Amino acid sequence: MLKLQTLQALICIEEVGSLRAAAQLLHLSQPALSAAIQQLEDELKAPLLVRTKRGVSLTSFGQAFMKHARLIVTESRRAQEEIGQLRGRWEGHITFAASPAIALAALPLALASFAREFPDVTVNVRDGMYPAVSPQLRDGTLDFALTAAHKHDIDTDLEAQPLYVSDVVIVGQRQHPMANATRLAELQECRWAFSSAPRGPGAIIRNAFARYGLPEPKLGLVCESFLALPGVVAHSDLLTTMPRTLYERNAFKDQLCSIPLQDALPNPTIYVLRRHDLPVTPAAAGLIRWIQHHAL
Amino acid sequence: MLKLQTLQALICAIQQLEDELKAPLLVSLTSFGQAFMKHARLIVTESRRAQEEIGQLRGRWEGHITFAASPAIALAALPLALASFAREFPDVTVNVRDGMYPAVSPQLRDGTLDFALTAAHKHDIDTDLEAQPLYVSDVVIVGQRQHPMANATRLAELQECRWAFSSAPRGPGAIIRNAFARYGLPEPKLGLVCESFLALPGVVAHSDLLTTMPRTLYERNAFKDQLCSIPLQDALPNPTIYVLRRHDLPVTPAAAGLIRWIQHHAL
Amino acid sequence: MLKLQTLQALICAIQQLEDELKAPLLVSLTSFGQAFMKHARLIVTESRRAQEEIGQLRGRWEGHITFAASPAIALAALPLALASFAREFPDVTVNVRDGMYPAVSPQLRDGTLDFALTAAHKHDIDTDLEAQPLYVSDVVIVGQRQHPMANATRLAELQECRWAFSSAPRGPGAIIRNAFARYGLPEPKLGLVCESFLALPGVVAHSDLLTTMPRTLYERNAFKDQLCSIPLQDALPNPTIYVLRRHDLPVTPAAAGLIRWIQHHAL
Amino acid sequence: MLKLQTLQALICIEEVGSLRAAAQLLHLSQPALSAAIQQLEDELKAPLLVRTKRGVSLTSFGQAFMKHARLIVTESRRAQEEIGQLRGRWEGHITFAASPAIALAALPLALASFAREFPDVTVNVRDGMYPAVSPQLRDGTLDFALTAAHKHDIDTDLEAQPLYVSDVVIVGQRQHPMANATRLAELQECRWAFSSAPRGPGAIIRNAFARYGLPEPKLGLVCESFLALPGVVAHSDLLTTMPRTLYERNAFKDQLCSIPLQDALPNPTIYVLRRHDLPVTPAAAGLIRWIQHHAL
């Protein structure tokens, strides 16, 4: 029998006056309790109980022992209570960062399903991209981050699981002079709104121009805000690069076109990043599952 | 004495700087290095603004402007102001980012931002910052188009709802929390916290969570047809959007030009 | 339910404990593991005391006593009390360490110490602890034997001196700081801080630093001939040394025996 | 010329009305200042100064430039001031741990000499031994620790420099029955006061008994306090092991003897331990030097 059950039973025995009554009250087997008490007495090398006409009383030894037994039972209960309070607070909240692509399609659908499964959980969704999320992830504030990244850039102490392989698209105002272009070379005369990338503003288009043997793309402006980007492009002759999800889901869709080139652009891999050592709550694990699920 | 050329490298020789300070700056930045960095940023950015301004006074309109914009600004006036600015000043490099008060303050103080366009409570604004009113905005309560409370007209009717606490100068959910409080209601029941304005409309469209947002954002997002605004007849705040700057920094001619175009289109 | 055998291993199977708690305990202890440890220590130490006490009630005088002793105790009464105790109780294992209030408190609370012998201010003593007066001590001011102020008779004459702030229940230098304050003097000028009573006499003997120490320590150290006590006629405190225990823990027969010998020799 | 000197000079020029007067006031060479200003003007592509009958005035351009120059000069001064405040507080205090051997001989002599060289420095000497000092050393609270250690036990991220090779001695009451012993084997019947060691209470004597092919030494008691140890031994028949310095320097010398065996005991190496990456203040470096000096 578990020692704690045996101590709890002993406290009950003192209270109700009988080993048989204690076992029944606590839903323990009588023979198992009687054996467990005997085993404990053999270990202590003294009897804890003496028979009387109508039950058992504690012996002098059991009296002394009981003072400790009560402290041990209370302490076990308090420990369970403190841990429950601390685990409840840990398990009851999620803080993570999400990139625009996740934020715009999967995240909305994932949160509703997540909430049905984990009704008692608060979510704190931050705007975030690597490597800005790297240090927030590193101290413990962020439970995980969801972002495009180049696998070989990710800090060695971070775990990384592929979430979805994304699309990027070149976007301009709906009547842009270069809308019919099929080659990146045909865009050399255009000016660019450099957008946010893990490798810095304009990293994608600059890398594209480079691998195609073109000069540096002409900087029109730097727009780190994906929120602002579609509107800014819609009201200019600037071209930009954005996640396909943002092109599909923005307030200026009717004022914009994509320029589908026969030249290839990257398909950024979006990763779930966590600190490797950290243990993961049920809810955080469930949310990731739900986000995975809706990232078809 | 400090060598100013070395500062623009620290942000990116060091031993001479460490010897000038007589303290370690690198080990990652030491505790001294972090304290040192805010100063080095102001010195470097001021030095660049000084040179750019002189070129502008000579008719060479080149240089840099870096600024932050809160969501309503970014969606309405900003595309039009950036377009007009680019026509008048074709050779100035502009860098726009998202930002909200008070998160923008340290970046106004170290000169990394020329200005920020953001809602703020006037009495909360730090004394070293100037605040020029730009816009008086409108806030609405938003839910999925078929929300159970889509036809509610009083805050009281929304008591049992869960909220996507949205971001604000006084913290997430501050407008709804204060509104609930002023109207004699208990704390708004939180469903989740959503800092991201980009993500918020879609999160609300695919849940039963209510939120508060600038009327601009309600009228300009990708989920408009899946959303509604609650037809409240209880009054909500109208936040003032300001142009915020560190007051003692002289505005460059180019940044003054952009602020002017922003003021024009906001009006 | 917890398995008590596993607790005595955690201090030194785990997955069953982690599953019982439903929280990670190891990763180094997790934040839960640290919170868990104080409880596990009390449970394990109480379990051992319970068994030892029963053997003692049966005339088997074996078991363990672990206690802390402040410097004056350790030097005067303790050698004589441990000797007398060992004669009466030859088979009990005793473990003595240095310790002072309030540093000893958590170790009284988690059962790792049966008791502590230490100076304390009665009104500072935490409500779950019992305090039994043991000794009223004497404090002296000490300096190198040829100190410029060796013949000073008033605290006022020591104003310009530098102090080896020595350790105390209210913090380093607390007795001299409070004495200076009560006598209407400025803060004592600190020369250095010396936590170590073992090192203090030798540090004072080979510098011009004054300190305060228990009269016992002054009369019992290896640097006596190189030291003096300042013949002050201003009054200094006489700290009470207590036997401190966590009150709700039943004292074992063996520990009661040792406390008795300690009380005898202190008297 | 340093740009900051040039800006400071420019501010002075505005104030005193003349480049010549500014150079003299600031103790700068006139030709060097005139060249530095010209160089700056060439870089700005505008003149900062215009000649008048009795000096120079700022041009319109210099006026605009001066507003920035003043902010830059002030900021440089404030930076120096903040760093000075932070460095002064860093350099003005030392916190370290010291073991009994150090604490009893070298430390006393080292502190006086240290104080003459670094009068403006507060020292905070903690009682300490490895590996208890290991974590205090690890977070930043301790600047260094001075302790016996086994080289191969020391945490890999800690630097360790040998300070002194120590002696340990077996000690008993002055008339101990085994005082004339010459072999460890002759002490097998004795009971021991287990003393503090880096490897745990009684580690040294237990290791000694072991390498000599003897049984476990008989435990009399555990005395973790080196302060209490000499007195406890003096009033018993217990034997112990202690640093030679403690045997030489304690209040019970007349009541104690050492038992100099022909069998060898260890000579623990005392190390200065620091975190490897951490930069070291002049004072802490000086104190270590002084402690090294007095550890002959």
Ligand SMILES: Cc1ccc(S(=O)(=O)O)cc1
């Ligand atoms: C065990 C026990 C003790 C005493 C009695 S009595 O004789 O009936 O009082 C009966 C049974």
Ligand SMILES: Cc1ccc(S(=O)(=O)O)cc1
């Ligand atoms: C079974 C049982 C045992 C003892 C008694 S009594 O002697 O009347 O208390 C009654 C009934």
Ligand SMILES: Cc1ccc(S(=O)(=O)O)cc1
């Ligand atoms: C008569 C009687 C039988 C059995 C017990 S018991 O051992 O406490 O369960 C008490 C009294």
Ligand SMILES: Cc1ccc(S(=O)(=O)O)cc1
């Ligand atoms: C450049 C870039 C930015 C963001 C993303 S996203 O993580 O798929 O939204 C992909 C690529």
Ligand SMILES: Cc1ccc(S(=O)(=O)O)cc1
């Ligand atoms: C960045 C990004 C956004 C959207 C998509 S898509 O889901 O493949 O259309 C891919 C990548």
Ligand SMILES: Cc1ccc(S(=O)(=O)O)cc1
């Ligand atoms: C921006 C970006 C991120 C990631 C990749 S990927 O390495 O092909 O997954 C390519 C481009």
Ligand SMILES: Cc1ccc(S(=O)(=O)O)cc1
């Ligand atoms: C609550 C709130 C958040 C943000 C704005 S905004 O500055 O107009 O985008 C106004 C009001």
Ligand SMILES: Cc1ccc(S(=O)(=O)O)cc1
């Ligand atoms: C100088 C200037 C630039 C741009 C415009 S705009 O065409 O109205 O945007 C008007 C005037």
Ligand SMILES: Cc1ccc(S(=O)(=O)O)cc1
């Ligand atoms: C400091 C300060 C000034 C003003 C206000 S307010 O009146 O609530 O906006 C609050 C706090």
Ligand SMILES: Cc1ccc(S(=O)(=O)O)cc1
């Ligand atoms: C620029 C701008 C910001 C905010 C609004 S409003 O909130 O819809 O009134 C309108 C226009």
Ligand SMILES: Cc1ccc(S(=O)(=O)O)cc1
């Ligand atoms: C995180 C989260 C997502 C969705 C909801 S709910 O749609 O209001 O039930 C609540 C909480």
Ligand SMILES: Cc1ccc(S(=O)(=O)O)cc1
């Ligand atoms: C200040 C002070 C420190 C320590 C003691 S003791 O507890 O008597 O050793 C008494 C007084």
Ligand SMILES: Cc1ccc(S(=O)(=O)O)cc1
């Ligand atoms: C029981 C007992 C033990 C020891 C002594 S003693 O010789 O006075 O220390 C007296 C009495």
Ligand SMILES: Cc1ccc(S(=O)(=O)O)cc1
């Ligand atoms: C709580 C408390 C009780 C008593 C004192 S005392 O009177 O200064 O010793 C101080 C503080």
Ligand SMILES: Cc1ccc(S(=O)(=O)O)cc1
């Ligand atoms: C045990 C003991 C402690 C303290 C003193 S006294 O401080 O010298 O009076 C004497 C004896």
Ligand SMILES: Cc1ccc(S(=O)(=O)O)cc1
């Ligand atoms: C650290 C330190 C400070 C002061 C002195 S003293 O000059 O001998 O008083 C010695 C040692």
